[PDB]
Amino acid sequence: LFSQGGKGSAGILTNKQAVARHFGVKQSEVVYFSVGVDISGYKVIYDKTTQRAYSLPIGIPAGTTAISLSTAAVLVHSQGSVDLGAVAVLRKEYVTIPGDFTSGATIQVKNEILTHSNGAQYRWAGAVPKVVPAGSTPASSGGISASAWIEVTGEELRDELATTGGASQIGTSDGKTVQQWIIANDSANYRA
Amino acid sequence: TIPGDFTSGATIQVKNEILTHSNGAQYRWAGAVPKVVPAGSTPASSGGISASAWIEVTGEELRDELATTGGASQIGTSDGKTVQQWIIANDSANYRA
Amino acid sequence: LFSQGGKGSAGILTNKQAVARHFGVKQSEVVYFSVGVDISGYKVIYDKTTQRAYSLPIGIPAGTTAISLSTAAVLVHSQGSVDLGAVAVLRKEYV
Amino acid sequence: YIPFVFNNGSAAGGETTIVVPDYTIGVPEIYVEGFRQQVGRGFTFNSVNLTVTLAQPLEQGDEVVLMLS
Amino acid sequence: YIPFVFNNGSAAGGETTIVVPDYTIGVPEIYVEGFRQQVGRGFTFNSVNLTVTLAQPLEQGDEVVLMLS
Amino acid sequence: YIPFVFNNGSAAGGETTIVVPDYTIGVPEIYVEGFRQQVGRGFTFNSVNLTVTLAQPLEQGDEVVLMLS
To answer: Could you tell me if C24 and A95 are in contact, meaning their C-beta atoms sit under 8 angstroms apart?
Structure first.
């Protein structure tokens, strides 16, 4: 290849531009991780080894330095430890890992989401290194539950519908909510 | 997705900026150019969750479509009939009452 | 414009970085398509003509070469044909 | 070195080899879109044919500045 | 060539033209952030005023190394 | 200038300092992946030890072309 400065030490700034544009942050707000960098004031941290970028939680005190970053994106800094995968899951900054359930992929970080043949992406809510054998399904690999594979595109609306107010957000053909119609027809259950 | 969350406080400059909350949902502000959110706030506390207020983005269109008159018809029951069909089937109880 | 190496042949590596960051894959796992490239071991393929990048399906045998890539992202390789648009739809990698 | 600009600064595309003028007894450097290339790494210059064999085929509009010795 | 660094390596922003010292009878190359620019393409040098007219206005903090002849 | 290529064009990674041959009485330029570096900005050359102190530690496979004077 031509020597285009996208490799190694000469690609830090362009990679920071790419990460900032992906995360919607400033280029100066992306930091490369090594042993001793000040992660204060930075908003996204990039792991050179895994080539994965994670949003740094806000409120990191000024002068905080990093010691190690695990392959599960577990960041230990001078003032504590942060699971960057959990932060990315909270911010829905998912990485759709290449492959699917039918082929088998291994999940290193909580934000990694695995595609299935139904078109849905499922994130694992258990265990740092969830391993998925070839030919598996979310039901076969642990099921689809809160402590198991969770569909990501409809996670929040599914959880909100599962609450006590879910029936009230769904309207019927007459302009009344499903909850109102359930309350209207509950006389049958009371009578029975 | 602007960096930060509702519990930490972020200021929304542009309508496309969406703020994360502790429930994992991202909410966009439908009001006002410079929506400011204080630290420790929630979408309900910061203006509520409505059409003129914070709107969840990942399920916005399906939530609006379910809220229409056809929402019950898109939801199937255990017997293969839609929720709207079962509501129409059991409405004799309401009529009788 | 300044000569900043983002054009044509000198922009392959930076474009690969951008594609890899968009797809969450390694930069070495992105391949440019032409007539005869080995698409084995690569995870994302980039079409230079349409400037669109598609995730290559896994399980492509080692030594597989590409003949043509249609404007509908239909990729015909030496071991078969793959509709990369259908693969992207399955992976929800929408444009 | 004498800077030689290939095709007014815009290559026609698919160019693997570039022919330099006679004066050129050597091409120590190639600048593809501002990127310096080293002999044997980004390009190989043969003195017999006076042709620079490039590592990549040039794309349309590529600016290649050839340093002639 | 004599390398001339514009404003200690950090341009003030919005700079279209750069004034070179008297010695400069020609500016064959401009290096904007490590990018070599060719005369007439990325910049034009006028010998009368001793000013390099750049293709783009410089942004704040840009490193421009001017080669003086 | 005499171009010196560090470790056949592929650095071993984590290299902060580069030792140049004796002939080198000065290193005016460093080309890291085609990027020209200026003395004092991207690297500092000390004549006593004949070592180029780089602004960044080199990564594995980095192409660094050292210009020796």
So the answer is: yes
Q: What is the resolution of this structure in A?
A: 2.4
Residues after which chain B is discontinuous, using a C–N cutoff of 2.5 Å: none
- What is the three-class DSSP state of F18? strand
- Residue C52 CA to residue C39 CA, distance in Å, equals 16
Q: Is A117 helix (H, G, I), strand (E, B) or coil?
A: coil
Find, among F22, F29, F25, the residue nearest to F3 by Cα. Answer: F29
Q: How many whole angstroms separate alpha carbon C69 and alpha carbon C45?
A: 10
DSSP D53: E
Cα gap A54→D34, rounded to integer Å: 32
| Residue A105 bridge partners (DSSP) | none
Cα gap A95→E67, rounded to integer Å: 46
Q: Tell which residue, F35, F22, F30, F20, has the closest CA to residue F54.
A: F30
Facing C18 at nearest CB: one of A18, A52, A121: A18
Give the angle subtended at the CA of A71 by the CAs of A110 and A151, to the nearest 5°: 15
* Positive or negative: CA dihedral A133, A137, A142, A148: positive
Maximum Cα–Cα distance for chain F, whole Å?
A: 28
Report how far apart, in Å, the C-alpha atoms of F23 and of each of A47, A173, E13, F20, F53 are: 40, 89, 40, 8, 18
Considering only CB atoms, which chain A residues are within 8 Å of C55? Answer: 98
Residue type, C23: F
CB B13, CB B34: distance < 8 Å = yes
In angstroms, rounded to a whole number, what is the distance separating the alpha carbons of residues B89 and B49? Answer: 33
Q: What residues contact C95, with CB distance under 8 A and at least 6 apart?
A: C52, C88
B85: amino acid identity, one letter: Q
* Cβ contact, residue pair C13, A6, below 8 Å: yes
Q: How far is A2 from chain D (nearest CA, A)?
A: 5
Both tokens of B5, joined, read: 């969350």
Contact between chains at D59 and C2 (C-beta distance less than 8 A)? no
Can you list the positions of beta strands (E) in B1-97?
18-20, 26-28, 55-56
The b-or-e profile of A24-34 (16+ CB within 10 A means b, else e) is ebeeebbbbbe
Give the 3-state secondary structure of residue A26. Answer: coil
The values of phi and psi at residue B35, to 5°, are -55, 125
CA distance to partner chain F, nearest, from residue E33 (Å):
8
Q: What is the bridge-based pairing of β-strands C30-32 and C44-47?
A: parallel
With beta carbons less than 8 A apart as the criterion, state whether C63 and C52 touch. no
Q: Hey, which residues does C82 pair with through a beta bridge?
A: C75
Q: State how far residue D25 is from chain A, nearest Cα, in angstroms.
A: 23
Alpha carbons A31 and A40: distance in angstroms, whole number: 10
| Experimental approach | cryo-EM
Q: Does F50 touch chain D (CB under 8 A)?
A: no
- Do residues D65 and D37 touch, judged by C-beta distance below 8 A? no
Token output for E22: 């008297």
Of the candidates D39, D36, D42, the residue with the CA atom closest to the CA atom of residue D28: D39
Residue of F1, F5, F32 best to disrupt the D interface, most CBs of D under 10 A = F5
**Cβ contacts of D36 on chain A, cutoff 8 Å:** 3
